[PDB]
Amino acid sequence: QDAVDYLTWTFLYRRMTQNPNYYNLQGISHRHLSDHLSELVEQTLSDLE
Amino acid sequence: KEMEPLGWIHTQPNESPQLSPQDVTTHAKIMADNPSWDGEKTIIITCSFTPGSCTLTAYKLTPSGYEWGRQNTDKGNNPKGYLPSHYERVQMLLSDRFLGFFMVPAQSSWN
Amino acid sequence: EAKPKFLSKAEREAEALKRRQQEVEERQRMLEEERKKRKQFQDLGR
């Protein structure tokens, strides 16, 4: 959860709501944004583990 | 799978102010064999080659026409029981505000 | 809402399955409504 919070501060998040297709997203809906953020953070954490 | 069938459009070598028995029977047979075609939404669009011009007209199949076509079997030019109450004209118009597309057979061509 | 929450993979797949069930149920309902409308047209023309 703190990881998602930290992501909420970067620029990537700002564009993930204006140009979603650039980031493999399919919608600006909060549901889609949360799902994608969770997926990317979990993937990076799993790779680090 | 997302759109809804609305009928068919076919050419006509010459203009005829009335929908032909062949067209009405074809539409009725298609509708009867396939439940998807709704008798109120489907139509037939005729593009007749008038001198140096294409005249487009849209027709709808009334329930009486549907029954007559489904029961009919004669393929001649003047089948029995073909009446002008079997069809009615619907409003159609052209538009530049969007673009449609085509879909052809995979293995072979269409013609 | 505004803040993005975190969802586990199990929760995400369960939610997707629920949404797929919802949409297939809507499709079946629409098919039965289409059957009803077709029956109405047929028995109106008969």
Tab-separated table of C-alpha atoms in Angstrom:
chain	number	residue	atom	x	y	z
A	1	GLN	CA	0.000	0.000	0.000
A	2	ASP	CA	2.854	2.384	0.806
A	3	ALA	CA	4.428	1.328	-2.497
A	4	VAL	CA	1.293	2.395	-4.369
A	5	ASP	CA	1.280	5.624	-2.355
A	6	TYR	CA	4.888	6.298	-3.377
A	7	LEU	CA	3.961	5.673	-7.016
A	8	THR	CA	1.155	8.219	-6.639
A	9	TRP	CA	3.871	10.917	-6.515
A	10	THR	CA	5.817	10.152	-9.708
A	11	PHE	CA	5.158	11.672	-13.126
A	12	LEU	CA	4.245	8.281	-14.606
A	13	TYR	CA	1.048	8.351	-12.547
A	14	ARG	CA	0.159	11.794	-13.907
A	15	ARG	CA	0.306	10.554	-17.509
A	16	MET	CA	-1.359	7.222	-16.671
A	17	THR	CA	-4.611	9.216	-16.517
A	18	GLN	CA	-4.167	11.217	-19.756
A	19	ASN	CA	-2.482	8.785	-22.188
A	20	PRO	CA	-3.355	5.304	-20.901
A	21	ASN	CA	-2.722	3.469	-24.175
A	22	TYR	CA	0.949	4.473	-23.996
A	23	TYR	CA	1.215	2.309	-20.850
A	24	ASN	CA	-0.774	-0.754	-22.007
A	25	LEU	CA	-3.774	0.524	-20.033
A	26	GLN	CA	-7.333	0.080	-21.285
A	27	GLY	CA	-9.206	2.804	-19.382
A	28	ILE	CA	-8.909	5.857	-17.134
A	29	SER	CA	-11.282	4.261	-14.638
A	30	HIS	CA	-10.037	4.098	-11.063
A	31	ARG	CA	-10.541	0.330	-11.255
A	32	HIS	CA	-8.219	-0.050	-14.249
A	33	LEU	CA	-5.636	2.335	-12.802
A	34	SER	CA	-5.562	0.536	-9.448
A	35	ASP	CA	-5.346	-2.867	-11.132
A	36	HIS	CA	-2.429	-1.798	-13.326
A	37	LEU	CA	-0.566	-0.136	-10.452
A	38	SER	CA	-1.007	-3.219	-8.270
A	39	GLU	CA	0.159	-5.475	-11.099
A	40	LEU	CA	3.310	-3.475	-11.824
A	41	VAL	CA	4.243	-3.031	-8.162
A	42	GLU	CA	3.676	-6.720	-7.408
A	43	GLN	CA	5.717	-7.716	-10.461
A	44	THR	CA	8.661	-5.518	-9.471
A	45	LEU	CA	8.515	-6.697	-5.852
A	46	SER	CA	8.383	-10.341	-6.955
A	47	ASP	CA	11.384	-9.857	-9.241
A	48	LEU	CA	13.298	-8.232	-6.387
A	49	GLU	CA	12.354	-11.120	-4.087
B	1	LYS	CA	-20.959	-10.061	-32.264
B	2	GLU	CA	-21.372	-6.467	-31.025
B	3	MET	CA	-23.527	-5.076	-33.847
B	4	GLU	CA	-27.085	-6.112	-34.697
B	5	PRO	CA	-28.098	-7.380	-38.164
B	6	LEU	CA	-30.225	-4.805	-39.978
B	7	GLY	CA	-30.875	-6.643	-43.259
B	8	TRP	CA	-29.183	-6.560	-46.645
B	9	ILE	CA	-28.489	-4.171	-49.519
B	10	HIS	CA	-28.491	-5.245	-53.164
B	11	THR	CA	-28.172	-3.641	-56.576
B	12	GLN	CA	-30.875	-3.427	-59.244
B	13	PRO	CA	-30.158	-3.104	-62.990
B	14	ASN	CA	-33.187	-0.824	-63.389
B	15	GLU	CA	-35.546	1.080	-61.116
B	16	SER	CA	-38.854	-0.445	-60.009
B	17	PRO	CA	-41.210	1.555	-57.745
B	18	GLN	CA	-42.186	-1.655	-55.888
B	19	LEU	CA	-40.212	-4.215	-53.919
B	20	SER	CA	-39.973	-7.351	-56.002
B	21	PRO	CA	-41.542	-10.702	-55.051
B	22	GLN	CA	-38.059	-12.234	-55.167
B	23	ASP	CA	-36.709	-9.695	-52.679
B	24	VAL	CA	-39.636	-10.083	-50.285
B	25	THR	CA	-39.481	-13.887	-50.371
B	26	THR	CA	-35.701	-13.852	-49.881
B	27	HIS	CA	-35.994	-11.599	-46.834
B	28	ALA	CA	-38.836	-13.693	-45.410
B	29	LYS	CA	-36.887	-16.934	-45.875
B	30	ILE	CA	-33.786	-15.440	-44.253
B	31	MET	CA	-35.783	-14.149	-41.284
B	32	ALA	CA	-37.653	-17.429	-40.810
B	33	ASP	CA	-34.519	-19.575	-40.957
B	34	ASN	CA	-32.569	-17.224	-38.655
B	35	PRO	CA	-34.197	-16.015	-35.399
B	36	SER	CA	-31.605	-13.234	-35.085
B	37	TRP	CA	-33.242	-11.075	-37.770
B	38	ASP	CA	-35.896	-8.992	-36.022
B	39	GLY	CA	-38.829	-8.306	-38.328
B	40	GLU	CA	-38.999	-4.679	-37.178
B	41	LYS	CA	-35.317	-3.673	-37.426
B	42	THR	CA	-34.210	-5.504	-40.578
B	43	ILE	CA	-34.720	-3.770	-43.924
B	44	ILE	CA	-33.758	-4.090	-47.596
B	45	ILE	CA	-31.908	-1.300	-49.417
B	46	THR	CA	-32.201	-1.178	-53.211
B	47	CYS	CA	-29.664	0.717	-55.331
B	48	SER	CA	-31.114	1.044	-58.836
B	49	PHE	CA	-28.883	2.249	-61.681
B	50	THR	CA	-30.861	5.123	-63.140
B	51	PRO	CA	-29.235	7.096	-65.974
B	52	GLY	CA	-25.830	8.186	-64.692
B	53	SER	CA	-27.072	7.955	-61.118
B	54	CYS	CA	-27.796	5.523	-58.302
B	55	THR	CA	-31.215	5.771	-56.651
B	56	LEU	CA	-31.370	4.291	-53.148
B	57	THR	CA	-34.580	3.241	-51.417
B	58	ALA	CA	-35.210	1.343	-48.182
B	59	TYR	CA	-38.084	-1.067	-47.537
B	60	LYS	CA	-39.319	-2.832	-44.403
B	61	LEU	CA	-41.071	-6.208	-44.286
B	62	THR	CA	-44.521	-6.173	-42.697
B	63	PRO	CA	-45.798	-9.267	-40.851
B	64	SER	CA	-48.161	-10.071	-43.726
B	65	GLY	CA	-45.218	-9.988	-46.117
B	66	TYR	CA	-43.205	-12.176	-43.760
B	67	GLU	CA	-45.943	-14.810	-43.648
B	68	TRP	CA	-46.516	-14.716	-47.409
B	69	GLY	CA	-42.803	-15.027	-48.135
B	70	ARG	CA	-42.251	-17.848	-45.656
B	71	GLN	CA	-45.191	-19.831	-47.048
B	72	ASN	CA	-44.419	-19.028	-50.691
B	73	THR	CA	-42.427	-21.333	-52.960
B	74	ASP	CA	-42.920	-19.958	-56.490
B	75	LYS	CA	-39.784	-18.162	-57.696
B	76	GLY	CA	-41.431	-16.572	-60.736
B	77	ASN	CA	-41.784	-12.892	-61.517
B	78	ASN	CA	-45.487	-12.752	-60.536
B	79	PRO	CA	-46.207	-15.178	-57.685
B	80	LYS	CA	-49.735	-15.543	-56.373
B	81	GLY	CA	-50.729	-13.502	-53.336
B	82	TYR	CA	-48.026	-10.830	-53.656
B	83	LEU	CA	-49.683	-7.622	-52.447
B	84	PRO	CA	-48.397	-4.076	-51.788
B	85	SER	CA	-49.325	-4.481	-48.102
B	86	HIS	CA	-46.391	-6.880	-47.633
B	87	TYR	CA	-43.820	-4.069	-47.315
B	88	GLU	CA	-43.469	-0.452	-46.240
B	89	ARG	CA	-40.859	2.219	-46.909
B	90	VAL	CA	-38.525	3.324	-44.104
B	91	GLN	CA	-36.477	6.510	-43.849
B	92	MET	CA	-32.800	6.277	-44.811
B	93	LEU	CA	-30.178	8.962	-45.337
B	94	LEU	CA	-26.459	9.377	-45.954
B	95	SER	CA	-23.877	10.741	-43.530
B	96	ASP	CA	-20.259	11.913	-43.725
B	97	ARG	CA	-19.788	11.948	-39.943
B	98	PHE	CA	-18.457	8.384	-39.600
B	99	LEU	CA	-16.938	5.561	-41.636
B	100	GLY	CA	-18.081	1.972	-42.048
B	101	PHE	CA	-16.017	-1.031	-43.076
B	102	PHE	CA	-16.277	-4.297	-45.000
B	103	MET	CA	-15.873	-7.980	-44.194
B	104	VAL	CA	-15.168	-10.568	-46.897
B	105	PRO	CA	-14.665	-14.362	-46.857
B	106	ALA	CA	-11.359	-15.701	-45.595
B	107	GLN	CA	-10.340	-18.534	-47.914
B	108	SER	CA	-11.790	-17.315	-51.230
B	109	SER	CA	-13.265	-14.167	-52.741
B	110	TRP	CA	-16.950	-13.272	-52.685
B	111	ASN	CA	-18.059	-13.228	-56.327
C	1	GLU	CA	-12.493	6.648	-5.333
C	2	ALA	CA	-9.638	9.170	-5.587
C	3	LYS	CA	-6.832	7.328	-3.810
C	4	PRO	CA	-5.899	4.016	-5.487
C	5	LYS	CA	-6.134	0.957	-3.250
C	6	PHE	CA	-4.103	-2.216	-3.724
C	7	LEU	CA	-5.813	-5.424	-4.866
C	8	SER	CA	-4.283	-8.891	-4.714
C	9	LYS	CA	-4.191	-11.158	-7.755
C	10	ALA	CA	-6.752	-13.509	-6.192
C	11	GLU	CA	-9.125	-10.605	-5.552
C	12	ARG	CA	-8.582	-9.259	-9.069
C	13	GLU	CA	-9.341	-12.614	-10.697
C	14	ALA	CA	-12.408	-13.073	-8.483
C	15	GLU	CA	-13.688	-9.614	-9.433
C	16	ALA	CA	-13.066	-10.313	-13.123
C	17	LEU	CA	-14.944	-13.613	-12.829
C	18	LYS	CA	-17.846	-11.837	-11.123
C	19	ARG	CA	-17.947	-9.231	-13.897
C	20	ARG	CA	-17.849	-11.946	-16.569
C	21	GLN	CA	-20.726	-13.749	-14.846
C	22	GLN	CA	-22.663	-10.479	-14.706
C	23	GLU	CA	-22.182	-9.783	-18.412
C	24	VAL	CA	-23.038	-13.347	-19.460
C	25	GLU	CA	-26.191	-13.146	-17.333
C	26	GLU	CA	-27.083	-9.875	-19.061
C	27	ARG	CA	-26.472	-11.528	-22.437
C	28	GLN	CA	-28.770	-14.434	-21.557
C	29	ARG	CA	-31.429	-12.004	-20.328
C	30	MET	CA	-31.148	-10.050	-23.583
C	31	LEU	CA	-31.458	-13.291	-25.558
C	32	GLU	CA	-34.658	-14.215	-23.717
C	33	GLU	CA	-36.014	-10.695	-24.264
C	34	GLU	CA	-35.208	-11.083	-27.967
C	35	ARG	CA	-37.075	-14.395	-27.950
C	36	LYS	CA	-40.070	-12.669	-26.355
C	37	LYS	CA	-40.034	-9.858	-28.928
C	38	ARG	CA	-39.736	-12.354	-31.786
C	39	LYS	CA	-42.662	-14.352	-30.397
C	40	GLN	CA	-44.682	-11.137	-30.136
C	41	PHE	CA	-43.968	-10.309	-33.778
C	42	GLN	CA	-44.736	-13.854	-34.939
C	43	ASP	CA	-48.061	-14.151	-33.106
C	44	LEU	CA	-48.992	-10.624	-34.196
C	45	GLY	CA	-48.413	-11.625	-37.822
C	46	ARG	CA	-50.116	-15.000	-37.361
